[PDB]
């Protein structure tokens, strides 16, 4: 029971982290397509 | 530690509301807060 | 006086080049600030430079 | 007048050195921007400097 | 992820060929790509 509850909440936290990283990806792609940031920043956002 | 993370997140959110921070900084602050939350959940599971 | 005119024209060309750089920076930064991709302070600095 | 000409020639040499540096920078950045190795902003800054 | 690492490595190699990057940057890119390869191998072992 303790594992079920704790891993449910932890999965929620990790899902929030994944969503934040996806938003950072979207912003980095938008910047790169505009010619402001280099390809390295976009690729690093992908990796992260 | 999580209290500290939330304080930093609040400060970064207030700073972006004033335009002094990019959305990238807000996203990284959110990511750090979520990362700390997962650690708190893991510690809760261990204690229980 | 021809040499003085040449010097003035060179300075004008340098100013025009800097203006072109500023215009390109502002044109790139304008759509980004609408999606928060860049800070409002950076966009204001770019506009002041322009 | 000879000394003034020497001073002007020295300033011209300094300007030519800066132009050579800018030309080398632009020549190196030209193929890299096509493969997105550097940001478009950096390429425009290099062109403005040239 | 490995694909992203190789893309970054190719870009960094092309930048050093043009002299815009130091050999230290190429070495760090190589190290990151090799690190990613090890993760791929570990995950292959886990899946098998």
PDB file of N, CA and C in Angstrom, chain C residues 17-18 20-21 24-25 28-29, chain D residues 40-42 44-45 47-49:
ATOM      1  N   UNK C  17      25.475  50.040 -41.548  1.00  0.00           N
ATOM      2  CA  UNK C  17      25.705  48.635 -41.219  1.00  0.00           C
ATOM      3  C   UNK C  17      25.240  48.317 -39.804  1.00  0.00           C
ATOM      4  N   UNK C  18      25.569  49.189 -38.848  1.00  0.00           N
ATOM      5  CA  UNK C  18      25.106  48.971 -37.481  1.00  0.00           C
ATOM      6  C   UNK C  18      23.584  49.017 -37.401  1.00  0.00           C
ATOM      7  N   UNK C  20      21.517  48.153 -39.795  1.00  0.00           N
ATOM      8  CA  UNK C  20      21.026  46.901 -40.359  1.00  0.00           C
ATOM      9  C   UNK C  20      21.126  45.769 -39.346  1.00  0.00           C
ATOM     10  N   UNK C  21      22.238  45.710 -38.610  1.00  0.00           N
ATOM     11  CA  UNK C  21      22.373  44.701 -37.562  1.00  0.00           C
ATOM     12  C   UNK C  21      21.279  44.853 -36.511  1.00  0.00           C
ATOM     13  N   UNK C  24      17.881  43.707 -37.904  1.00  0.00           N
ATOM     14  CA  UNK C  24      17.779  42.252 -37.922  1.00  0.00           C
ATOM     15  C   UNK C  24      17.546  41.692 -36.526  1.00  0.00           C
ATOM     16  N   UNK C  25      18.260  42.217 -35.526  1.00  0.00           N
ATOM     17  CA  UNK C  25      18.067  41.747 -34.158  1.00  0.00           C
ATOM     18  C   UNK C  25      16.636  41.984 -33.692  1.00  0.00           C
ATOM     19  N   UNK C  28      14.157  39.628 -35.423  1.00  0.00           N
ATOM     20  CA  UNK C  28      14.193  38.281 -34.865  1.00  0.00           C
ATOM     21  C   UNK C  28      13.573  38.227 -33.475  1.00  0.00           C
ATOM     22  N   UNK C  29      13.807  39.250 -32.653  1.00  0.00           N
ATOM     23  CA  UNK C  29      13.355  39.201 -31.268  1.00  0.00           C
ATOM     24  C   UNK C  29      11.863  39.461 -31.122  1.00  0.00           C
TER      25      UNK C  29
ATOM     26  N   UNK D  40      22.071  32.395 -36.636  1.00  0.00           N
ATOM     27  CA  UNK D  40      21.946  33.430 -37.656  1.00  0.00           C
ATOM     28  C   UNK D  40      22.307  34.799 -37.094  1.00  0.00           C
ATOM     29  N   UNK D  41      22.021  35.025 -35.809  1.00  0.00           N
ATOM     30  CA  UNK D  41      22.378  36.290 -35.179  1.00  0.00           C
ATOM     31  C   UNK D  41      23.886  36.502 -35.184  1.00  0.00           C
ATOM     32  N   UNK D  42      24.653  35.451 -34.888  1.00  0.00           N
ATOM     33  CA  UNK D  42      26.106  35.566 -34.912  1.00  0.00           C
ATOM     34  C   UNK D  42      26.613  35.872 -36.316  1.00  0.00           C
ATOM     35  N   UNK D  44      24.979  37.448 -38.705  1.00  0.00           N
ATOM     36  CA  UNK D  44      24.650  38.835 -39.018  1.00  0.00           C
ATOM     37  C   UNK D  44      25.563  39.800 -38.274  1.00  0.00           C
ATOM     38  N   UNK D  45      25.924  39.472 -37.031  1.00  0.00           N
ATOM     39  CA  UNK D  45      26.881  40.297 -36.303  1.00  0.00           C
ATOM     40  C   UNK D  45      28.232  40.317 -37.005  1.00  0.00           C
ATOM     41  N   UNK D  47      28.768  39.836 -40.222  1.00  0.00           N
ATOM     42  CA  UNK D  47      28.625  40.619 -41.446  1.00  0.00           C
ATOM     43  C   UNK D  47      28.626  42.114 -41.150  1.00  0.00           C
ATOM     44  N   UNK D  48      27.942  42.523 -40.081  1.00  0.00           N
ATOM     45  CA  UNK D  48      27.947  43.927 -39.693  1.00  0.00           C
ATOM     46  C   UNK D  48      29.349  44.385 -39.319  1.00  0.00           C
ATOM     47  N   UNK D  49      30.097  43.540 -38.608  1.00  0.00           N
ATOM     48  CA  UNK D  49      31.474  43.880 -38.269  1.00  0.00           C
ATOM     49  C   UNK D  49      32.330  44.015 -39.518  1.00  0.00           C
TER      50      UNK D  49
END
